[PDB]
Short mmCIF file of C-alpha atoms in Angstrom, two decimals:
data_model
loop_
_atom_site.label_atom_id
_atom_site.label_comp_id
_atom_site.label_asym_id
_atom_site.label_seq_id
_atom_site.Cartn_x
_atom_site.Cartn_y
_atom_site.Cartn_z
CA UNK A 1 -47.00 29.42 -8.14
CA UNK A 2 -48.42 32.80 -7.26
CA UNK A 3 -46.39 36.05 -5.78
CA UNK A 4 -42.79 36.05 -5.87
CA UNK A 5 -41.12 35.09 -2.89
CA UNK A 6 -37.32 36.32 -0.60
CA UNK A 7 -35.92 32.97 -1.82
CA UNK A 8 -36.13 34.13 -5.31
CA UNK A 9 -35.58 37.16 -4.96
CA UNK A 10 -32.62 36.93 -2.95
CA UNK A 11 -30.52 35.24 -6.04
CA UNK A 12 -31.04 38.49 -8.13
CA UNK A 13 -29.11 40.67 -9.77
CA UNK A 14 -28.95 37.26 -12.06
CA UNK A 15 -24.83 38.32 -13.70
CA UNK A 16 -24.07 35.37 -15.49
CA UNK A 17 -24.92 31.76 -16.95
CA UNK A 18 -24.19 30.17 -13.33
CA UNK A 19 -26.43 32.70 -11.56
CA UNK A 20 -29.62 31.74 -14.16
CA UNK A 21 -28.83 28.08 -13.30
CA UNK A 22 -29.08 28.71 -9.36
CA UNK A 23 -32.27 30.21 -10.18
CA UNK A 24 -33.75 27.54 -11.68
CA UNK A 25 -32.09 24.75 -9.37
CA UNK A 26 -34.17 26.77 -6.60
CA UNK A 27 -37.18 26.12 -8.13
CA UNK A 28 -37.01 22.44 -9.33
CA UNK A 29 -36.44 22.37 -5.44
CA UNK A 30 -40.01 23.82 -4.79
CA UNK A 31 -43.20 21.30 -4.67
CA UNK A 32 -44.55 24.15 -7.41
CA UNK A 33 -41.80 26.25 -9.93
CA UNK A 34 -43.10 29.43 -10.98
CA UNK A 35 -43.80 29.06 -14.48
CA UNK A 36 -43.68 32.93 -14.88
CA UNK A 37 -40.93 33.70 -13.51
CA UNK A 38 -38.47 31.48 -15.26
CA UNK A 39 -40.09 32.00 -18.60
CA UNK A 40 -39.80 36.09 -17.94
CA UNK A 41 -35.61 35.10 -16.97
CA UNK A 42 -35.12 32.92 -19.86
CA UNK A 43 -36.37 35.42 -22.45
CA UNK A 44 -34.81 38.51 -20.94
CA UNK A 45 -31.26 37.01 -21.28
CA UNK A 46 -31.98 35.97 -24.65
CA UNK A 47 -33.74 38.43 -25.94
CA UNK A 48 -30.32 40.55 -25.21
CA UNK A 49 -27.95 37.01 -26.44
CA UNK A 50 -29.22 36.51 -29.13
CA UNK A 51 -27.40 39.19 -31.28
CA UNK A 52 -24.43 39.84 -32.75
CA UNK A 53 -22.16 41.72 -30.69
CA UNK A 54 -18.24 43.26 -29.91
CA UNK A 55 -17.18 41.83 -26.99
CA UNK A 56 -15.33 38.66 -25.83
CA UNK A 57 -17.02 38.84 -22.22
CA UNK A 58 -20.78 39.36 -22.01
CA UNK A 59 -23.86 38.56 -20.10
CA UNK A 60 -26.98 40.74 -19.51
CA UNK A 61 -27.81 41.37 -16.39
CA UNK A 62 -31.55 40.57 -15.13
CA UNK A 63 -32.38 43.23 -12.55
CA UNK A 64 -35.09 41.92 -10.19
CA UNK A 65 -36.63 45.45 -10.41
CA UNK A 66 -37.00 44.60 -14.33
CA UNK A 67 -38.17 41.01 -13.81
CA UNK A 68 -40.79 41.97 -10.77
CA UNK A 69 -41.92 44.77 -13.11
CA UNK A 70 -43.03 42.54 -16.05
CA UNK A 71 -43.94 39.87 -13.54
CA UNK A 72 -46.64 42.08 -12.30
CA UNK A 73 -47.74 43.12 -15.46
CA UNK A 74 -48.23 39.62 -16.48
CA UNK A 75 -50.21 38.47 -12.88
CA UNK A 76 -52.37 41.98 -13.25
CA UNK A 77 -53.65 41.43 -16.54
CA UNK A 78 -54.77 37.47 -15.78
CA UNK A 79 -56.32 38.46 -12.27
CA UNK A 80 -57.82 41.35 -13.53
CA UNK A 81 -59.50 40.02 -16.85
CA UNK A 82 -60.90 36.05 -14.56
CA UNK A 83 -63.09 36.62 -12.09
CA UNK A 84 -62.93 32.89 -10.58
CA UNK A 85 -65.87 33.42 -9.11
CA UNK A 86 -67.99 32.83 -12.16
CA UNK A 87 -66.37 29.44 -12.35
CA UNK A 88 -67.36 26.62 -10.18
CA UNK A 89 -64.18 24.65 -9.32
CA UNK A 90 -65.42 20.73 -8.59
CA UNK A 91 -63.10 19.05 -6.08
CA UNK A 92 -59.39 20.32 -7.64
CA UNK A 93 -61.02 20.14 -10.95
CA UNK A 94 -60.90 23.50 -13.74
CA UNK A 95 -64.34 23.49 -16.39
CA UNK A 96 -63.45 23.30 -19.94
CA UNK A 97 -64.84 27.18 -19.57
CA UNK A 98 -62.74 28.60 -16.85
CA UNK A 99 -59.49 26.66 -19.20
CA UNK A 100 -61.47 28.48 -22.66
CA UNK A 101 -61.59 31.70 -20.96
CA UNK A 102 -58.06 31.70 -19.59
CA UNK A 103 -56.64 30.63 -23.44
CA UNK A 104 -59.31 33.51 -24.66
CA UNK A 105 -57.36 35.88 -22.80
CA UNK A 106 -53.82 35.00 -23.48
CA UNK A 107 -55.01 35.02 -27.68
CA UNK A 108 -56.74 38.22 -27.28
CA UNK A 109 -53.80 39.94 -25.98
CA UNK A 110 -51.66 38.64 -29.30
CA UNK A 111 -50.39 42.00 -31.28
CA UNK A 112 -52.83 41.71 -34.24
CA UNK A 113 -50.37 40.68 -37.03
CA UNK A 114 -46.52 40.25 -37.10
CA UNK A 115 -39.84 34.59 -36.14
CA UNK A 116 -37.59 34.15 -33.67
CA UNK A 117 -37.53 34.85 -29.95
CA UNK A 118 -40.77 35.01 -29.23
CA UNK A 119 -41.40 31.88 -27.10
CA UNK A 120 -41.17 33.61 -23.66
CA UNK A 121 -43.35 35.46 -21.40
CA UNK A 122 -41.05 38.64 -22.02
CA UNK A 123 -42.31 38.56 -25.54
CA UNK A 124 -45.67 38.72 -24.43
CA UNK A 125 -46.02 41.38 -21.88
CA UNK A 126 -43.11 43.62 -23.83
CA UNK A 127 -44.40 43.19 -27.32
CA UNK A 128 -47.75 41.36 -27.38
CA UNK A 129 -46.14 38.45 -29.34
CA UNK A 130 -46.07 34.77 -29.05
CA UNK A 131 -45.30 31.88 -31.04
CA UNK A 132 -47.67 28.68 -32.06
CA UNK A 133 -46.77 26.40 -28.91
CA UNK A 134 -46.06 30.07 -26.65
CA UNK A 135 -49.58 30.36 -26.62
CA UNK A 136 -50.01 27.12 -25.00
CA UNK A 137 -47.51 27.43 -22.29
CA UNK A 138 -48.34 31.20 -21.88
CA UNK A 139 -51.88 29.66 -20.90
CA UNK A 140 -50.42 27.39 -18.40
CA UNK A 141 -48.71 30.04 -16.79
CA UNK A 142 -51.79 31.89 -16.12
CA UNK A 143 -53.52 29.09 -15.11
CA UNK A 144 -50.71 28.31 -12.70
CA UNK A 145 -51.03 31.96 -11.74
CA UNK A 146 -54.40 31.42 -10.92
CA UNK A 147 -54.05 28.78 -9.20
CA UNK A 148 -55.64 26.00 -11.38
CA UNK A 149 -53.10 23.06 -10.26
CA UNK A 150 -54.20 20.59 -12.82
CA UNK A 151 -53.91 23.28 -15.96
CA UNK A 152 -50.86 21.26 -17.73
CA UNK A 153 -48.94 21.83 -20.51
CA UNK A 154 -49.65 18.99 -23.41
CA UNK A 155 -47.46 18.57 -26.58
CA UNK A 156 -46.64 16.16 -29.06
CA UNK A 157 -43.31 16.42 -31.90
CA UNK A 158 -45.10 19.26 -33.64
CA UNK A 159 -47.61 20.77 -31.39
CA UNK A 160 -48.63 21.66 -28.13
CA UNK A 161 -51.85 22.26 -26.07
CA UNK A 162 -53.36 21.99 -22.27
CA UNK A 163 -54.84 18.79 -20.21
CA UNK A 164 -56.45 19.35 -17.31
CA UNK A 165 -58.98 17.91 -14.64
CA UNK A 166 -58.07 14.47 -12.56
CA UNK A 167 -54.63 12.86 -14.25
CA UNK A 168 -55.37 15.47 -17.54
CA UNK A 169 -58.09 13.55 -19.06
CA UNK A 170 -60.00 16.78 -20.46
CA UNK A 171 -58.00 18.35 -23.43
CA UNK A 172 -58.73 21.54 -25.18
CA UNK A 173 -56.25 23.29 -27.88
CA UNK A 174 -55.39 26.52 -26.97
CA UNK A 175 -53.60 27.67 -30.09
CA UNK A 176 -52.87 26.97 -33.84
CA UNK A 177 -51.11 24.85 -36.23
CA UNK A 178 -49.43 25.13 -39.71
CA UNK A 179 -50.42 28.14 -41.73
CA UNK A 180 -53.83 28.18 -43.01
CA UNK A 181 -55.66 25.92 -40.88
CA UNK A 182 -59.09 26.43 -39.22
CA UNK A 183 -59.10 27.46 -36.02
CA UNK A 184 -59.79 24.25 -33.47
CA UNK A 185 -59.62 26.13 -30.67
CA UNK A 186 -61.41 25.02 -27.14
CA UNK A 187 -61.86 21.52 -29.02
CA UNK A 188 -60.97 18.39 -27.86
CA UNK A 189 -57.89 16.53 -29.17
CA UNK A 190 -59.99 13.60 -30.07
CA UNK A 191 -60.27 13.50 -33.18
CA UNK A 192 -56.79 13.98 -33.87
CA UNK A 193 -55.71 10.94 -32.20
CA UNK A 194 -58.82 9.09 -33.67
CA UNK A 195 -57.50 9.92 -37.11
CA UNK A 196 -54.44 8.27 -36.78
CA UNK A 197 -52.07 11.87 -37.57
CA UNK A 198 -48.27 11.90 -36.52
CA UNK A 199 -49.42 14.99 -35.10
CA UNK A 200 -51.01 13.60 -32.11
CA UNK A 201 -49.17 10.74 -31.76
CA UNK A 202 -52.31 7.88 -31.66
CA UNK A 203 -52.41 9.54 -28.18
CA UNK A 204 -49.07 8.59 -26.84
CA UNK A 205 -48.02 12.09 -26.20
CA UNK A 206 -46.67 13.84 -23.19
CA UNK A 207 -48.68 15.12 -20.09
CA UNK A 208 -46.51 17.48 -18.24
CA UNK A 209 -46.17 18.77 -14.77
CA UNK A 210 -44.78 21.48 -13.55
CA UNK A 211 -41.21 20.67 -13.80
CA UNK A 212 -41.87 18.82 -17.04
CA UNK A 213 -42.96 22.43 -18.20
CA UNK A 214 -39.31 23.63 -16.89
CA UNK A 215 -37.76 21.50 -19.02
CA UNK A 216 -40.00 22.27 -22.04
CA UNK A 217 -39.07 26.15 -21.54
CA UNK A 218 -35.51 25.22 -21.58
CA UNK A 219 -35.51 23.13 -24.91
CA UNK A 220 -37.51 26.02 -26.33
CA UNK A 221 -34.11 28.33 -25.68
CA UNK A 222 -33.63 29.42 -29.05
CA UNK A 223 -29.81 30.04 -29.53
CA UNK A 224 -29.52 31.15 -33.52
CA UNK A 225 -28.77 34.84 -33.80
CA UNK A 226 -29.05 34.56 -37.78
CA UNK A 227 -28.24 31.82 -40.30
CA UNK A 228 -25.04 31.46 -39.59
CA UNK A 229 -24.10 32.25 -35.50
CA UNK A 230 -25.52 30.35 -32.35
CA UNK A 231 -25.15 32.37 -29.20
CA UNK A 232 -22.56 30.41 -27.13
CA UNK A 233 -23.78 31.81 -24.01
CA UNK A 234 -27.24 30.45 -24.93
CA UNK A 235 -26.06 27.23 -25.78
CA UNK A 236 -23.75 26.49 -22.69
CA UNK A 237 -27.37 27.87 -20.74
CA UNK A 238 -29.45 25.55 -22.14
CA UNK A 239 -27.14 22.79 -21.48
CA UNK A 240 -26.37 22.84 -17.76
CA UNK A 241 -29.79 23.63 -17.41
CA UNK A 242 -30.59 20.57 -18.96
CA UNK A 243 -28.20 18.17 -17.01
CA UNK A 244 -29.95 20.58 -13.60
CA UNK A 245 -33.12 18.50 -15.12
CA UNK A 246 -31.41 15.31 -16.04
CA UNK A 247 -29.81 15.03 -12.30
CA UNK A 248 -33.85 15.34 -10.89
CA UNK A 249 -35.46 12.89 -13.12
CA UNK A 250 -37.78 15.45 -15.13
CA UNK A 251 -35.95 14.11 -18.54
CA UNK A 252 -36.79 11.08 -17.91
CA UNK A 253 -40.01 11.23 -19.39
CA UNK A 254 -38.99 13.97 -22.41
CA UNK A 255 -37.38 12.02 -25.18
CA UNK A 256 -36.99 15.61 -27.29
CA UNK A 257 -35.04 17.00 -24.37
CA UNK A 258 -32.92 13.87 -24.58
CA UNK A 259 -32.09 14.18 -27.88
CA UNK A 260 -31.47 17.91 -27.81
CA UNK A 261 -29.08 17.50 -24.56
CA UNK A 262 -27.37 14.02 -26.66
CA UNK A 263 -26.98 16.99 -29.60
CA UNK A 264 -25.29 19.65 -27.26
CA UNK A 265 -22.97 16.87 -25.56
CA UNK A 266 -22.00 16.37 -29.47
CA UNK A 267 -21.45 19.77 -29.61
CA UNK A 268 -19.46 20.12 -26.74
CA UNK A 269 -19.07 17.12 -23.80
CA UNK A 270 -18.96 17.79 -20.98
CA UNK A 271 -16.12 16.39 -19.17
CA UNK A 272 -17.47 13.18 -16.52
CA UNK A 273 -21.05 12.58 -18.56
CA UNK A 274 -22.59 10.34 -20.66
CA UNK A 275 -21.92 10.09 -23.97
CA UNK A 276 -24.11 11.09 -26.96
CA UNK A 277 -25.11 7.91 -27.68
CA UNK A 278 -26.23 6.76 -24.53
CA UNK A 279 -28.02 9.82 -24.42
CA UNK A 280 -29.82 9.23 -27.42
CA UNK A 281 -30.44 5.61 -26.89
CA UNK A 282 -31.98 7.22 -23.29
CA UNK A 283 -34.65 8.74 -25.48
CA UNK A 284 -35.27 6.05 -27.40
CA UNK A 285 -35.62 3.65 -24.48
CA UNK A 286 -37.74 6.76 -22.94
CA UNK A 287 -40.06 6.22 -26.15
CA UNK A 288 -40.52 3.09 -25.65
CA UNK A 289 -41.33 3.14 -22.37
CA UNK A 290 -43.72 5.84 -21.89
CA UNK A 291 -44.99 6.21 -25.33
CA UNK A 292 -45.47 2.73 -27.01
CA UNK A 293 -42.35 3.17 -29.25
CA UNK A 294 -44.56 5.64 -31.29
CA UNK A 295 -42.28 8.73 -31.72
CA UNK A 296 -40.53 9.33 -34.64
CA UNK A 297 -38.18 12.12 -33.33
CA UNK A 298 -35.72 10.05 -30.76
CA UNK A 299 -34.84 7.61 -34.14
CA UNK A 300 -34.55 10.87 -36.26
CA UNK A 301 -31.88 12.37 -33.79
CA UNK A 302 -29.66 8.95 -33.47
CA UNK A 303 -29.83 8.96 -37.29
CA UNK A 304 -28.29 12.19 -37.70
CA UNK A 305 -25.49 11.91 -35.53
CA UNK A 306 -24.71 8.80 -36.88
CA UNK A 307 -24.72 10.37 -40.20
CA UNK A 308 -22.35 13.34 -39.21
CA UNK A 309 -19.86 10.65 -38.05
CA UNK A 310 -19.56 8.86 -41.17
CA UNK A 311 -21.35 5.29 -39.42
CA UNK A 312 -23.22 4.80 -42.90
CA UNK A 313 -24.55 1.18 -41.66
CA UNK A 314 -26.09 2.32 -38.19
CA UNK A 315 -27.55 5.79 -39.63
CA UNK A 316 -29.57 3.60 -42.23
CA UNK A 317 -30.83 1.44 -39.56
CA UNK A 318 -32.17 4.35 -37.10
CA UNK A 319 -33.67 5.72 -40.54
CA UNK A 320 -35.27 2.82 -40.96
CA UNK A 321 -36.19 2.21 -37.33
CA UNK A 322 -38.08 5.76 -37.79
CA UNK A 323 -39.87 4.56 -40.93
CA UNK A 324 -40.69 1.25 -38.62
CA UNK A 325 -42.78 3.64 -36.65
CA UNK A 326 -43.99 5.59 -38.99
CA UNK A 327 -45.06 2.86 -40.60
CA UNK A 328 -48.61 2.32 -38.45
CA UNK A 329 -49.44 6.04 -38.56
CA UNK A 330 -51.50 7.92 -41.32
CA UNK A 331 -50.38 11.04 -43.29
CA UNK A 332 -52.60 13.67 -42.74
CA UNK A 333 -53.27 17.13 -43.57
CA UNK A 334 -51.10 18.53 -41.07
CA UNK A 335 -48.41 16.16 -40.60
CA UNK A 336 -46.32 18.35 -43.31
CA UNK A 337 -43.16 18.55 -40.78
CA UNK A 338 -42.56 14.75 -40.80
CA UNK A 339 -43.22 14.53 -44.63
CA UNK A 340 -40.58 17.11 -44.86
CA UNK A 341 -38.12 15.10 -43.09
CA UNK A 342 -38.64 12.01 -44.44
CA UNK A 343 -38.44 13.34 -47.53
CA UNK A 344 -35.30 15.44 -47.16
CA UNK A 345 -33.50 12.16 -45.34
CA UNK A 346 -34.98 9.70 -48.43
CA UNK A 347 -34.42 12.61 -51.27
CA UNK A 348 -31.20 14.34 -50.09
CA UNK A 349 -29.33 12.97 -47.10
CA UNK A 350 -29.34 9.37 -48.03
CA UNK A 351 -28.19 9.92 -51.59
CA UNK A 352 -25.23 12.30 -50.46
CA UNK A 353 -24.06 9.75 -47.82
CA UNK A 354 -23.93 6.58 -50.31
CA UNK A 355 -22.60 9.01 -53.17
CA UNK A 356 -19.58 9.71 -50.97
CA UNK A 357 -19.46 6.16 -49.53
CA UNK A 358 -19.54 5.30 -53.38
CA UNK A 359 -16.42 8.21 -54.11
CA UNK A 360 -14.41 6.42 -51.20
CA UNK A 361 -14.80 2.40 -52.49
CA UNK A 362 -13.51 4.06 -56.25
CA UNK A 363 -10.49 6.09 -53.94
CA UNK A 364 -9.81 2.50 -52.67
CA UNK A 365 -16.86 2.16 -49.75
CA UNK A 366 -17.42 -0.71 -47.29
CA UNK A 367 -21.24 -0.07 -46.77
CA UNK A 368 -21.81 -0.08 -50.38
CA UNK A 369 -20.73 -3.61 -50.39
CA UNK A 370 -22.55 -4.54 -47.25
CA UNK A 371 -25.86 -5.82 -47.94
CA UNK A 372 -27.24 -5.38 -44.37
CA UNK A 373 -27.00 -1.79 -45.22
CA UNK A 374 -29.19 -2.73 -48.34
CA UNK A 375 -31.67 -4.80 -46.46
CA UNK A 376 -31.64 -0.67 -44.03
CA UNK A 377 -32.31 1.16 -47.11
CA UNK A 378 -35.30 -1.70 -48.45
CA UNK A 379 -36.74 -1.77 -44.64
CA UNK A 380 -36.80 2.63 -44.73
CA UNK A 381 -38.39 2.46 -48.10
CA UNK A 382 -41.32 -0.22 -46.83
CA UNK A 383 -42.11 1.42 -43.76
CA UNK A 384 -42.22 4.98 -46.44
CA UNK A 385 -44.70 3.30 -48.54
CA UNK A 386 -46.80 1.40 -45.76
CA UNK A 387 -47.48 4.34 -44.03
CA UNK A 388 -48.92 5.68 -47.08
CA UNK A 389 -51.36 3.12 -47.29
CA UNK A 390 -54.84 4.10 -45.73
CA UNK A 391 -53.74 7.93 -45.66
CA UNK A 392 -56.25 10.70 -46.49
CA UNK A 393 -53.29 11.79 -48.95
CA UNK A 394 -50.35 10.60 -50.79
CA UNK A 395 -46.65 10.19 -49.99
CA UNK A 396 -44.65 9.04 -52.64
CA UNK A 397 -44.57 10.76 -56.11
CA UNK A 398 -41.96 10.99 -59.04
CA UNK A 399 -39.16 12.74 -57.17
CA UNK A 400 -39.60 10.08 -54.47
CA UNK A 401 -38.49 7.17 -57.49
CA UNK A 402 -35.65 9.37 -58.90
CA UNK A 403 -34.03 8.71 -55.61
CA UNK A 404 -35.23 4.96 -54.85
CA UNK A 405 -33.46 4.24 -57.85
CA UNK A 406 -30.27 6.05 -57.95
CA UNK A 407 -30.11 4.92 -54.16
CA UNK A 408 -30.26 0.70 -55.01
CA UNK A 409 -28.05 1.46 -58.26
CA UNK A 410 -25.37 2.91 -55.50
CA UNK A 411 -25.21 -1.59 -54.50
CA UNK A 412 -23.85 -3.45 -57.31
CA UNK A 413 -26.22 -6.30 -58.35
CA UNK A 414 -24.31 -9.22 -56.72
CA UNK A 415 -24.24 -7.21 -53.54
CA UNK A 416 -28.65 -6.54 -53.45
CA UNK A 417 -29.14 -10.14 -54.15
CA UNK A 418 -27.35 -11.29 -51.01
CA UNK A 419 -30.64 -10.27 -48.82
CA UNK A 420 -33.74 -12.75 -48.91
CA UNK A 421 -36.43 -10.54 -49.37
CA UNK A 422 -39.89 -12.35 -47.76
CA UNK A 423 -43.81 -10.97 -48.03
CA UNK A 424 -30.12 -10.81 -44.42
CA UNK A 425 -33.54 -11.71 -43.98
CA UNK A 426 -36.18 -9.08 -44.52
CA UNK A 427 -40.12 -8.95 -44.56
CA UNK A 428 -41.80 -6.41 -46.35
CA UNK A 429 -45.17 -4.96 -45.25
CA UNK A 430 -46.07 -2.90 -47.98
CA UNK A 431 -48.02 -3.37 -50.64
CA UNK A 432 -46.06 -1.62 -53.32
CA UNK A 433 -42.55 -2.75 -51.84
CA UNK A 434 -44.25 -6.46 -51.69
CA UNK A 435 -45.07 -5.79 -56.14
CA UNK A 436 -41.50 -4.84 -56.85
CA UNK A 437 -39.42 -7.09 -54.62
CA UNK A 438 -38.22 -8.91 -57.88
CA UNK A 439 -37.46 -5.91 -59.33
CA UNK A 440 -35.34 -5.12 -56.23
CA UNK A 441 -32.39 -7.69 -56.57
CA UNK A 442 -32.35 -7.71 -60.54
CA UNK A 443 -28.61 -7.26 -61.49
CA UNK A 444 -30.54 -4.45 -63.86
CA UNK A 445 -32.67 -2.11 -62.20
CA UNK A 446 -35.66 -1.37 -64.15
CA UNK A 447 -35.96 2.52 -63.36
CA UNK A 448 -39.12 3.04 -65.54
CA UNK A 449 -40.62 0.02 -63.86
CA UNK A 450 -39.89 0.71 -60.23
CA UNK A 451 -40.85 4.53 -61.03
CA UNK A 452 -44.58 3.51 -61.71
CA UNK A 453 -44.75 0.93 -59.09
CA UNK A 454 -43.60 3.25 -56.17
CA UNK A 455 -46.05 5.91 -57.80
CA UNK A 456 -49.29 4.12 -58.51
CA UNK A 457 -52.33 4.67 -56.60
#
């Protein structure tokens, strides 16, 4: 909340990974965690983690003079630039000006140009730098410093901004997206849901509270020291931290922090827990019940770990389950991130997996020859194409049919016309996918046909 108090204080000098985790375990015990002071702890020890260093044993140690000292600096500036008095609070309830003038002050303080590691409050108050969705929690921590209890932190699976009044039905962002975008600052996130963008998620994405904002500071640990090295120390942190959040329940609500704890099990189990898979079908059965099956991101995790183990048939289903959802959504002008993806997993990642499944069946292979894998690969490639039907801008192009084909020429002839394609037993949705079918199971694939089919308008 406000202040820092003995029972915080009396855990410092934090010396090590176990002494951070007490930390925070003390406040997930608290009705309020101090958004502030975690975020200030987090960033210190990686700020000095996160580089390459000689030394098998090392932790840096957060002095609470140090962490008071920058915790001041933080509370002075917000008190002294919001005089609450010129803002009328309503039964419990901030005005979409007190929230505008609290995210005024946070972006006026941003260093006036400039990565990584600079998601934490220490970036802010020691170098006047913040990243896109920093902003946003940065303004929930002053809010929270001020006292607003129903400030809360807002984000979807590429962007992040603030609810407020009873049960957060106001909205207003608070920083930006993407590159060269206008500025939508104080608005509403209406019309971003209205439009039907992956970016706001037809509305189904997450309110936080307070503890919900722990656990989004602790998936926004940042581990990479360069291109090449993770920081072990910051990995094995962000872990326990995360099972500290799994034990209380605030994950249960977080598919992204599912996923990203299923990925560092994978990484490393720990010895007595759930497997990755359960941990990943726990987001995905967190999707679907909190957030109308509409996320893309808990399918896009089970798919890649599926794919790093070699289970060709189950990685082609979870890609298609993600074009499933996809599917019903409309690509707009800044849903470039999931584009991205989709087109890296149609363009690059599918083709390498059945081009060594294709190099094992000539070595002596089996999903090449299984034609529910086919009917996985048709289903990812209809849900592709519907979802570019009714979008402000188009999805497939020329590279896209490069791909389609050399990925059904990877089946031999006999083994695509085993599925019963309907407008295995498989219905298509889209348009384009619905004009080709025939084309689809022909022992001889018609690349210059398919090509203009997937492409026209």
């Amino acid at each position: 909340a406000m202040g820092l108090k003995a029972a915080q204080k009396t855990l410092f000098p934090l010396r090590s990974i176990d002494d951070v985790v007490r930390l925070f375990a003390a406040e997930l015990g608290r009705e309020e965690p101090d958004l502030v002071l975690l975020s200030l702890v987090l960033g210190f020890v990686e700020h000095f983690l996160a580089v390459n260093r000689v030394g098998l044993t090392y932790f840096p140690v957060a002095d609470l003079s140090i962490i008071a000292a920058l915790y001041a600096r933080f509370t002075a500036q917000i008190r002294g630039a919001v005089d609450l008095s010129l803002y009328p609070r309503e039964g419990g309830v901030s005005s979409r000006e007190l929230v505008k003038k609290v995210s005024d002050v946070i972006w006026n303080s941003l260093s006036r140009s400039y990565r990584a590691h600079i998601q934490s409050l220490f970036s802010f108050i020691t170098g006047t730098k913040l990243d896109s969705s920093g902003v946003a929690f940065a303004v929930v921590g002053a809010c929270q410093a001020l006292g607003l209890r129903d400030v809360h932190l807002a984000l979807s699976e590429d962007h992040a901004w603030v609810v407020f009044g009873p049960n957060g039905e106001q909205t207003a962002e608070v920083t930006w997206h993407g590159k060269g975008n206008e500025d939508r600052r104080g608005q509403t996130v209406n019309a971003g849901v209205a439009e039907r963008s992956w970016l706001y998620l037809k509305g189904s994405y997450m309110r936080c509270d307070r503890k919900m904002e722990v656990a989004f500071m602790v998936c926004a640990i940042n581990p990479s020291i360069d291109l090449h090295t993770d920081s072990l120390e910051l990995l094995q942190l962000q872990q326990k931290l995360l099972w500290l959040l799994y034990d209380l329940g605030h994950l249960e609500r977080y598919p992204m922090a599912l996923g990203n704890l299923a990925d560092l099990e994978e990484l490393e189990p720990t010895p007595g827990r759930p497997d990755p898979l359960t941990l990943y079908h726990k987001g995905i059965a967190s999707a679907k019940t909190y957030y109308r099956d509409e996320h893309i991101y808990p399918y896009m995790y089970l798919a890649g770990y599926h794919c790093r183990n070699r289970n060709v048939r189950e990685a082609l289903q979870a890609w298609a389950d993600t074009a499933t959802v996809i599917q019903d959504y409309n690509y707009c002008r800044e849903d470039e991130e999931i584009y991205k993806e989709f087109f890296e997993v149609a363009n690059d990642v599918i083709p390498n997996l059945l081009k060594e499944a294709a190099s094992l069946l000539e070595a002596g292979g089996s999903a090449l020859q299984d034609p529910e894998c086919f009917a996985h690969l048709l289903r990812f490639y209809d849900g592709i194409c519907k979802w570019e039907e009714g979008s402000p801008t188009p999805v497939l192009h020329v590279g896209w049919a490069t791909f389609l084909v050399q990925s059904l020429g990877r089946f031999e002839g006999q083994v695509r016309q085993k599925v019963r394609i309907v407008s295995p037993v498989l219905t298509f949705q889209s348009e384009k996918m619905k004009g080709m079918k025939e084309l689809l199971v022909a022992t001889k694939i018609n690349s210059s046909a398919i090509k203009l089919q997937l492409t026209a308008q």
